[PDB]
Design a binder for this molecule. Structure first.
Ligand SMILES: O=C1C[C@@H](c2ccc(C[C@H](NS(=O)(=O)c3cccc(C(F)(F)F)c3)c3nc(Cc4ccccc4)c[nH]3)cc2)S(=O)(=O)N1
Ligand SMILES: [Mg+2]
Length: 298
């Protein structure tokens, strides 16, 4: 039924109309804290703000603001923190959030520079011997190792609370070829990556919410979370054909504005879920097929 709906949307050529209807029906909640004058330099984009009700609060008394939102999907039983690409002055805040929320994984879907423009600060160390210290938050971050694939890289980071000396291993899943306002090369390349994150254990409820970000934390980040959530629901319900992706996206938009930024990212989300359903329904060949198709060992 999901592919029947997909098939009729394609035949009618109504992706833009469907997507615009979602934009029109999406929740509108205040973002008063994000808009306070003192928080202007903590926001990368003036039109992308976290709603007050779902924003992540830093545990510091000075200013607890960070442009990050808790997306809590009740039925799917999974939470995600979606945030913008950190700014030069909010990298300490970013890691303080990771620490305080007890996240185990960070999913990055953009590159630091895209088409001649900075989209995110270099918030993690590129070299083992050049660790980073965020003085304002008292955290130390070290690159332990990295596994570089053709379109994505997985890194092992060690985050240390300098005050208590406790250290934690943080896994960084960096998708390096997802164009801004665009889509992955194929459902296979997207799913291969998603399942790598799932298999790492990072999404387990024993850990805090995975932190997902792109440049604004809504387009690419929204696509990633929508597909994951829909696949979770299909695996959970007695009838996987009951999953209404448009309803799931409207639910996600109650927690952060603008998730899914183009009609084609919405269409791609359908393809990813339709393709991923094969695995949910049993198929044990699709995963290797996805890896092969993704050409990750290029
Ligand atoms: O696939 C994506 C889209 C990126 C993205 C999404 C939103 C923004 C916020 C920008 N604010 S602004 O300070 O660059 C900006 C730009 C224009 C107007 C504007 C106001 F509405 F006037 F505030 C703000 C931004 N770019 C547009 C382009 C766009 C146009 C039509 C439909 C969809 C997107 C709209 N807002 C930046 C990156 S992502 O990193 O979330 N992944
Ligand atoms: Mg070296």
């Amino acid at each position: 039924e999901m592919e029947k709906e997909f098939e009729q949307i394609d035949k009618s050529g109504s992706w833009a109309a469907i997507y615009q209807d979602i934009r029109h029906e999406a929740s509108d909640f205040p973002c008063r804290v994000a808009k306070l004058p003192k928080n202007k330099n903590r926001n990368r984009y003036r039109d992308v703000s976290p709603f007050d009700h779902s924003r992540i609060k830093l545990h510091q008394e000075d200013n607890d603001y960070i442009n990050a939102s808790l997306i809590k999907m009740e039925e799917a039983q999974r939470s995600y923190i979606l945030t913008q690409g950190p700014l030069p002055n909010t990298c300490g805040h970013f890691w303080e959030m990771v620490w305080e929320q007890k996240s185990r994984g960070v999913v990055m879907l953009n590159r630091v520079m895209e088409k001649g423009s900075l989209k995110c600060a270099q918030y993690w160390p590129q070299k083992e011997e050049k660790e980073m210290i965020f003085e304002d938050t008292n955290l130390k971050l070290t690159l332990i190792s990295e596994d570089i694939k053709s379109y994505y890289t997985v890194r092992q980071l060690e985050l240390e609370n300098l005050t208590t000396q406790e250290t934690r291993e943080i896994l960084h899943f960096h998708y390096t070829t997802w164009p801004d306002f665009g889509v992955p090369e194929s459902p296979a390349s997207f799913l291969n990556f998603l399942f790598k994150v799932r298999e790492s254990g990072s999404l387990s409820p024993e850990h805090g919410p995975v932190v997902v970000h792109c440049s604004a934390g809504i387009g690419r980040s929204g696509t990633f979370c929508l597909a994951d959530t829909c696949l979770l629901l299909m695996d959970k319900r007695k009838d996987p054909s009951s999953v209404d992706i448009k309803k799931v996206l409207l639910e996600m938009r109650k927690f952060r504005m603008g998730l899914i930024q183009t009609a084609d990212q919405l269409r791609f989300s359908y393809l990813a879920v339709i393709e991923g359903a094969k695995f949910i329904m049993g198929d044990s060949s699709v995963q290797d097929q996805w890896k092969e198709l993704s050409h990750e060992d290029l």
